[PDB]
Amino acid sequence: RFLKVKNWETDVVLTDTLHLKSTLETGCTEHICMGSIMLPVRTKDQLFPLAKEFLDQYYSSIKRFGSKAHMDRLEEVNKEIESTSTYQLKDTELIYGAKHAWRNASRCVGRIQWSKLQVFDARDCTTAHGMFNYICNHVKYATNKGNLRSAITIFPQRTDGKHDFRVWNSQLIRYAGYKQPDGSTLGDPANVQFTEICIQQGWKAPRGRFDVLPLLLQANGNDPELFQIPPELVLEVPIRHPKFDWFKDLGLKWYGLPAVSNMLLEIGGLEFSACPFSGWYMGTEIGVRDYCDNSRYNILEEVAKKMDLDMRKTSSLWKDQALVEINIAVLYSFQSDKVTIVDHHSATESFIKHMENEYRCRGGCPADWVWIVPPMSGSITPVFHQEMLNYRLTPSFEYQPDPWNTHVWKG
Amino acid sequence: RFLKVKNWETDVVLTDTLHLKSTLETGCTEHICMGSIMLPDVRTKDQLFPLAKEFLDQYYSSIKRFGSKAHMDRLEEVNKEIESTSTYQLKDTELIYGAKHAWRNASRCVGRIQWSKLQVFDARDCTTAHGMFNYICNHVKYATNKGNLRSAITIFPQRTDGKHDFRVWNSQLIRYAGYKQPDGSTLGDPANVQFTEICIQQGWKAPRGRFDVLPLLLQANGNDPELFQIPPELVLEVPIRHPKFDWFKDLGLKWYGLPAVSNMLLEIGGLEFSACPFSGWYMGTEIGVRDYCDNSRYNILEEVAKKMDLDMRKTSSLWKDQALVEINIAVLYSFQSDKVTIVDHHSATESFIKHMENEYRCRGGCPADWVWIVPPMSGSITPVFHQEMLNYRLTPSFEYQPDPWNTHVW
Ligand code: HEM
Ligand code: HEM
Ligand SMILES: CNCc1cc(C#N)cc(CCc2ccc3c(C)cc(N)nc3c2)c1
Ligand SMILES: CNCc1cc(C#N)cc(CCc2ccc3c(C)cc(N)nc3c2)c1
Ligand SMILES: C[C@H](O)[C@H](O)[C@H]1CNc2nc(N)[nH]c(=O)c2N1
Ligand SMILES: C[C@H](O)[C@H](O)[C@H]1CNc2nc(N)[nH]c(=O)c2N1
Ligand SMILES: [Zn+2]
Questions:
Q1: Which positions are annotated as binding (6R)-L-erythro-5,6,7,8-tetrahydrobiopterin (chain A)?
Q2: Which of B320, B321, B345 is best to mutate for the A interface (most A CBs within 10 A)?
């Protein structure tokens, strides 16, 4: 069964066959769509089918499907599974797995770059300190003095679920958030809870509006430990506006490296619970969400005020006006400092080209419209008029509960 | 299976049970979500009756006479007429209920907080295009109300054998013409290029201006459709000017005040109203973001930004964005100045969240298509963006239907 998607701007129609190779479920049914819902201990019983499926994919990709190399590997993995209840990936497989996980990430507008991922194998890691070291090197390598590089670092796979490696931070680099007694928040409101945990674990908070948080690292199921990323590793960009001289005085800055660390990499049934990955920012991530979202730095008011906008009725679109300027300034600041950033126009255009290419060479490209469309100026980007099929392919990045809700504390 | 929806800006969590009353299909499966797909032979006597019963069961529930004398009788009454006439007719009250609830159930509509204040015009006695023209003129005049817009739907006779369909061939009652130019591109309104042709190709004399109000093309009882010109005094238009940029009026833009959609099919109790033009009032972005700035439309961003002397060299200056905002500031300012009803995308989305909360509270849910509820600009700074929404199809409903010229036994 074949499926068509249409771009209503350009009348380009594409045909998806890839969706047939889909395994996992969407949350949707015939009678309900959960397409806008944010979120919708594994035995050998179901592991080898997952392994075989991955290995079949892998050897297809290297044009060795059915080869003796393919069959022995299957045999080898089989034997290792029933013998050890799990199995290990070769380096080639791990790299393939991680790259395809990204490629399969249907909510990611950035997947044009997916084949150019730097994979760091941290599967020999055994301690938090070792994790800290691997992560430091990730950051230094990925940051590259502002010339950002995609990278992922992969810590040991889950075994019995009782010896998990986890990075407790949601991102490697993020600013603290402090609930004040008067109800106001100092720093990033998105990070208040994690900040508290860190503090409780013994972090000494400078309590400034832009304190880089400590890494909280958990190895082999042990209680997590605190580490401070060396500040010379944390590339930061002061935020100024090209026409508005008063913008710098808003005292804003942001870090250059977006590196997500709370997700789970699944490859051939194996679960990599600590697998931090990084790329570079689309400007709107910082400029729309990180600053202007009501539950974040929320500087919309202050910028509006300083622009002397009509902030009385909303129909003055003062919010819209400030939002643009703030995103103008974010892009301006980063480019001025030669730190890699992409604007939402460029990123969405690239994605459409990626997607079309993917339909031609791969038979489809799973995509989550709700997430792919930029959080501002949606319809003047070409993804807005792009119909998209959303389905779940493995290898995949998955969500997982915050470790502090599941962790058993040693003490 | 009593699903929850979270608002992530507010942690408000609503419980949805209404979805279990759903009947029709979404297009999705557990293997693939189609929620971004634009759109995924009459009724036999057999499948028509449960359809009627389902609708009548809701109706009498809503008037708290479920399982009552009145209910049972009417149920029996409709049942008899179906078996006999192979169809049936709605009581006026059921018609009104049906239409209002088709709007209530329209999961893509952000304006549904107003749903129960719909003015319903029963045009089921209509027999000719001239008749349709008259009913449509009265609709347009009533809805416009000198700029104090009012919601209305006018309902023409229900489908019979599919050979006698009532159809308004226009997509909206009021839309500007679109002309293919020898120079290459398009004058007027590009979305309406083919229709503007069909009109001419059916005998219309185009003024070939940029804002030529299209003629009505009405089809009664499945006959050759007919051209009618809407009296200009009934077509309220707003000249578009900017509150701070006096050069903006020189762009020579205007829009019409009445959004009135005329190509959809209203389904009630299994009956199919293929002609049922309905209208409300605009959210500002519908004109400013979409009608002006979409590339397959007026596409005026470029020249607007030029007059703003913005750096259009690289996309990263966000000149498109900047212009887009000014254009939309202008539209609102213009309409508001001329006392024509209009809502900004902040106001409408806020309204919708309240409406959502209301529907979960008094009805147990509210079907919603996030892809369509989120405005085409400033998405994440409107409240709907962080609002999880469940999408499912309830009846009565508005549905799509083929463009008539692809079907019509001419
Ligand atoms: C290199 C440039 C990249 C850009 C510009 C980019 C951009 C984005 C954006 C804007 C989102 C939406 C999230 C949000 O707005 O909150 C997203 C989602 C995502 N990205 Fe990318 N990304 C990049 C690289 C990567 C890399 C290297 C990986 C993994 C190795 C990745 C994996 C993902 C995943 C798994 C999601 C889904 C998030 C979720 O499900 O919650 N991305 N990306
Ligand atoms: C009164 C103020 C109203 C406002 C502000 C409003 C707003 C909107 C908007 C913004 C859309 C999205 C379409 C787009 O942006 O391209 C929409 C869709 C829709 N509206 Fe409403 N609307 C209103 C009244 C009504 C009324 C009176 C009806 C019918 C009785 C109605 C039925 C619908 C339907 C069926 C759709 C989706 C049609 C489809 O699936 O394509 N609306 N509306
Ligand atoms: C404003 N939304 C905040 C947010 C929420 C979730 C969730 N759930 C997940 C994320 C992270 C999604 C993500 C993951 C990876 C990214 C990479 C590698 C690069 C980039 N520029 N953005 C990303 C964005 C953010
Ligand atoms: C430019 N948006 C694309 C679009 C496509 C189709 C189709 N096919 C149909 C529609 C109609 C959507 C609609 C329907 C009714 C509306 C009413 C009654 C009021 C209003 N302000 N907007 C509407 C908008 C839109
Ligand atoms: C391809 C995509 O689904 C299509 O462009 C939809 C997206 N969301 C929309 N949302 C609204 N309000 N109006 C639209 O026309 C559309 N078009
Ligand atoms: C409810 C909704 O799914 C949620 O707010 C999503 C919507 N789309 C998004 N899109 C992006 N890029 N990032 C997000 O965080 C979200 N949040
Ligand atoms: Zn779906």
A1: 36, 370-371, 384
A2: B321
